[PDB]
Amino acid sequence: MARPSNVKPSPHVIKSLEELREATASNRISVIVFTHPDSKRSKEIKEKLKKLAEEFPDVDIYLVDTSTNPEAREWYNITSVPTFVIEKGGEPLGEVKGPDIDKLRETLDELLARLE
């Protein structure tokens, strides 16, 4: 993953293991979020992250379903479905566990100025 492909703001959701591990290898700014269709009352805060795309659409934000990457969960033992994973240059840079859509603007920021 060297040349450009997906960066601009637009709908793009994976659907396979390779697609996941691949997106993590990319040397761009991608925010992987774990979430599955199993909560009607919940998933309300989702809009929060959706709106963030406006403040800075330069970043790509997609959703991931364990249905395709189940082992991934146990891979790091996740307790908070709504997790936030950030990669860079094809490697783990950081990770957060908890509802902090507001503070999330500080995790990707420090990682943004670095690249751009």
Side-chain angles (χ1 to χ4, degrees):
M1 218 302 143
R3 268 156 282 285
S5 239
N6 221 312
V7 187
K8 258 190 264 276
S10 22
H12 177 31
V13 186
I14 83 305
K15 200 147 65 239
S16 252
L17 216 67
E18 246 271 304
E19 212 77 356
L20 220 74
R21 203 197 70 174
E22 182 176 283
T24 24
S26 178
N27 74 100
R28 308 236 71 161
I29 312 104
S30 303
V31 49
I32 312 111
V33 190
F34 165 39
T35 17
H36 45 233
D38 201 71
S39 221
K40 271 111 183 213
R41 248 199 62 200
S42 321
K43 239 218 236 195
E44 287 291 305
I45 57 87
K46 290 289 154 231
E47 208 137 65
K48 306 240 81 195
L49 192 68
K50 185 264 164 55
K51 281 188 191 170
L52 178 148
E54 180 250 286
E55 94 195 6
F56 201 50
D58 144 282
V59 185
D60 62 80
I61 311 113
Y62 69 111
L63 279 300
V64 186
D65 30 86
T66 26
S67 215
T68 43
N69 60 302
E71 278 124 78
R73 244 245 306 178
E74 218 168 58
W75 204 90
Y76 191 49
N77 334 298
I78 290 125
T79 51
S80 352
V81 233
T83 15
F84 266 124
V85 189
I86 336 181
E87 78 295 274
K88 211 218 87 223
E91 252 220 310
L93 190 66
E95 65 203 338
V96 181
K97 317 110 204 303
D100 64 350
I101 292 295
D102 233 280
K103 203 142 282 252
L104 181 106
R105 191 155 112 278
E106 86 98 51
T107 330
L108 90 89
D109 146 73
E110 306 283 317
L111 161 61
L112 209 304
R114 214 100 142 285
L115 235 294
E116 230 290 79

